């Protein structure tokens, strides 16, 4: 299935993904498309920050639904 990753900027990324994919695997797909380090990536769905350990199916995230990408900036 494909999901959307959207930032509050308005930039939208399409990701071919599986429900059994961990968020960590999703982050890698974003880095492969935008170069953003996973350490600076943080995905939020319905106001909940997704943890890398859990998968997409655990959050009942459906096809053609959108995750939100928010940056984690340090140092105032």
């Amino acid at each position: 299935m494909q999901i959307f990753v959207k930032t509050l900027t308005g930039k939208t990324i399409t990701l071919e993904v599986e429900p059994s994919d961990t968020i960590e695997n999703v982050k890698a797909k974003i880095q492969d498309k935008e170069g953003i380090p996973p350490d600076q990536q943080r995905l939020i769905f319905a106001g909940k920050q997704l943890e890398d350990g859990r998968t997409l199916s655990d959050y009942n995230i459906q096809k053609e639904s959108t995750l939100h990408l928010v940056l984690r900036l340090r140092g105032x």
């Binding site: 900027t9 939020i44 939100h68 928010v70 940056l71 900036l73 105032x76």
Partner: protein, 298 residues
């Protein structure tokens, strides 16, 4: 219309429909699993490892049941095809009016408050639509951006966010964005003050100098250009009480005796001496396999 399960079907229906309840082995995920105790509430279905049983897959030593759902408006495609349970949506079999417009609608939305207030779906749309525009949704630490009962009752927060799929797609897309924005704000994070860029940034605990992805360097505390030092500068109780979810008898198909529903389960065994018939409360006939799928409880 004998369905008691409502789901959201993303593909291919992209809408809310009636749903079929299924059960498989929690261990090996094979559809052949026999349940020992019928589900009586949504907690039996949603909570994990709550009901034991037997797995018909040879060799498998699994004990617990896994309940999932399918859309009942399109033929299943693959074993992976599943739907999301919208547990708060129920059949208004009690003919309970809405707390807002006092209409006897069907189906309805019943909040999980200790008091179980009831709303029709249209009022629910208007309830969410209004409270979204006024940034009145709460930013829950466990459930995310959500809403409680309109009466504001304890422990009534919506947990399955796909209930908001009852809303317009524009509102739902807005719901998620607002969800992200106030997630940032509640987490101590910041939103880039730039007009062209309102990036969501999770800054450090004590960070003044924030530099967004757009390159703009601004103050985290006052949201202005970066600097040093100090930053310069309606519910009617009459309606609500009547619109309350929290006597009724039906004859047995095998002996015509008067029977009352004990719990939430629809699978009923006649308590009469001569007749131990397995029958369904909804169909007023014999307990079939589709009764499990269409209306096992509720």
């Amino acid at each position: 219309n004998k369905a008691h399960f409502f789901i959201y079907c993303a593909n291919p229906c992209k809408k809310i429909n009636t749903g079929k309840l299924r059960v498989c082995c929690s261990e090996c995920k094979h559809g052949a699993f026999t349940v020992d105790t019928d589900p009586q509430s949504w907690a039996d279905v949603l909570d994990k490892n709550k009901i034991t049983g037997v797995c018909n897959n040879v060799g498998c030593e699994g004990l617990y049941a896994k309940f999932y759902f399918k859309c009942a408006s399109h033929p299943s495609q693959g074993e992976n095809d599943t739907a999301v349970p919208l547990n708060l949506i129920k059949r208004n079999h009690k003919k309970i009016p809405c707390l807002a417009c006092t209409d006897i609608c069907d189906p309805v939305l019943v909040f999980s408050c200790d008091n179980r207030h009831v709303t029709c779906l249209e009022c629910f749309k208007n309830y969410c639509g209004s409270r979204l525009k006024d940034r009145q949704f709460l930013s829950h630490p466990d459930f995310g951006y959500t809403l409680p009962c309109p009466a504001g009752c304890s422990n009534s927060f919506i947990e399955e966010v796909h209930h908001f799929r009852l809303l317009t797609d524009a509102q739902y897309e807005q719901y998620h964005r607002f969800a992200t924005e106030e997630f940032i704000l509640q987490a101590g994070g910041v939103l880039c003050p730039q007009p062209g860029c309102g990036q969501g940034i999770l800054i450090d605990q004590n960070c003044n100098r924030v530099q967004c992805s757009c390159g703009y360097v601004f103050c985290g505390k006052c949201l202005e250009g970066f600097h040093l030092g100090e930053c310069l500068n309606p519910l009617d109780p009459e309606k609500l009480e009547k619109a309350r979810w929290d006597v009724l008898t039906k004859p047995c198909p095998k002996c015509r005796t008067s029977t009352e529903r004990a719990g939430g389960c629809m699978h009923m065994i006649c308590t009469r001496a001569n007749c131990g018939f397995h029958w369904c409360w909804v169909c007023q006939g014999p307990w079939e396999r589709d009764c499990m799928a269409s209306h096992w409880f509720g």
